[PDB]
User: What shape does this take?
Amino acid sequence: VDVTRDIVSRERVWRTRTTILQSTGKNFSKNIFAILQSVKARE
Amino acid sequence: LGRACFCLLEGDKMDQADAQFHFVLNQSPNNIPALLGKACISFNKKDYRGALAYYKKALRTNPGCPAEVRLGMGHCFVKLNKLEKARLAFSRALELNSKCVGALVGLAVLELNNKEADSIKNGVQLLSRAYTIDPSNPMVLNHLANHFFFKKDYSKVQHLALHAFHNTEVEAMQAESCYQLARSFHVQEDYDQAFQYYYQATQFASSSFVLPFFGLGQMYIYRGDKENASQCFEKVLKAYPNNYETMKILGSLYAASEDQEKRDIAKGHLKKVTEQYPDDVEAWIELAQILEQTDIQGALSAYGTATRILQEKVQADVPPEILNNVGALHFRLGNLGEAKKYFLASLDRAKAEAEHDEHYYNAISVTTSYNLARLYEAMCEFHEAEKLYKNILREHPNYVDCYLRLGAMARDKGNFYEASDWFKEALQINQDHPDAWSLIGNLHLAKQEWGPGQKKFERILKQPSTQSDTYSMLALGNVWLQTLHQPTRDREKEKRHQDRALAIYKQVLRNDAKNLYAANGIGAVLAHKGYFREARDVFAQVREATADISDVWLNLAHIYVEQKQYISAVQMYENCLRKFYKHQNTEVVL
Amino acid sequence: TYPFDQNRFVQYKATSLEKQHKHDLLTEPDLGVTIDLINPDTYRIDPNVLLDPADEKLLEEEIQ
Assistant: This one.
């Protein structure tokens, strides 16, 4: 109905699900994938 | 001379023309306009020093010149703010011949600096006399045009700006002609034509000045063309920053979220105007409107003086959208009680919006009541939360979030309640809804015997419209890891499960480097692979990333007791016990 | 969000940014003079030469 688009337009979402999982700092995964490959070097 | 002046007509072979004029000085430097034609070339190469070097040689000799060598003298003195010499040159030009146009229009532009001071002599003596001695001069036509604009004579500006366009043929002049016709039809709201004028004004001579760029950018607010408004307004900041050019990019906020190319510049403009006050009213509104992603206290402060700023120009009550949002801020703060007061007075002000179904104060009250019911949940006043939720759903049953927060409330009581059924009917009203659909399997997390069955109930919206869903695919990883610590790893079954969870974790690794629950999963599965020296490091990363993940506290101390580092472990166990969750969590003391 | 007016129009106006601009004189690209060695049929170099006080203070580049 008009109420649905009427509300979901005017509000805002600053807090979702997905960026909870993502960290507020910058933690890249190269270090993570480097040790991922390093344990594979033990394999 | 004939071939050198042949070159200036076409805009090329210009240094060639200068060379053939300097061929004159090495054959016959016996008169000055041979070398003055060098100096106009030098002037048009923006070398006013090289112009005036030969121009000193003009007035020492002064050949027969009714064309007033002093006119170009003053125009070079117009350059680089040698104005007092420009005035004296145009004056002696007028004394030799008052009929000449260039001196009077030069002083006209020279006193275009002061408009509130010496208005009349600019308007009539400096301009209308030039119009009298030549009514076809596109300079004086342009200047009476912009004067008539400011004198609010919007008729004869369009009489003579067309001629000011046609009579000139150089780009910047007809750029200004199109720009002035554009500002004429802009205040006359004939914006379709004036848009074309603004674009032509930009396209003719662009490096001249930036008002046509501003005209196009604000014209892109017409007709929804605002994508080019940002791009065109960027050159206004490339021109020079001003208070003006903040608000255009601030209101034209393509910055929605995680888009810093419009958001960092928004921050810069907002702290370009926050210290200022060009009657700042909404400046705090669009301050805080990006601050809700950022620090919340900045948004609080913006709303604080924004509450005031609506009271002094007129004692006007704050619109309830502001007050609802500041209560929403205090919801994530400790200021829960006055957040409730904000929602109450928000609903009252929406009631004070008695006739505003255009603005739909009723819908604003709907979402305000949603926020207030969410607040009553924070009070643990689930009774009144039920009341507000059923009030909204009995009047807007199409809404889903109220339909499931009710379900979440009964989930706090338990799973097979109408919790699970509100959740399923939320999919019945909206099967496209990924949040509720995730919450369906979230219910099924309670039934871990429904472990391998969760492939199906987390496949339903693995339709790629919903994909990518990091939350759900990490849920797949988690239901895949709870399979572990079984005596079937030696049977290669949990080894395959470990590597499958590893594959999920690699997938979420590549699509997101900055997820932390992922890295927790990788460290967990490799710790189950017996690499505990290889685990405290990867958990250390998410440890600085955020300490406020209850899982990593446990998983680090598991490593510690695996080195038998109890005196490093149990303290962090009770640190995990510092959350307000459960006085005796069982597995933690286990 | 706030229901902002679409600011498709100027009333402040930009006139602070407008009259600060000093406008070029490009009526004739060789700077408003016909460049000719034939139309000087006359010459002040003959007795007597003429040079106004304004003309000497324009014969200087920058001496103030």
Q: What stands out?
A: Chain C has two helices and no strands. The first helix of chain C runs from residue 15 to 19. The two ends of chain C are 60 Å apart (CA to CA).
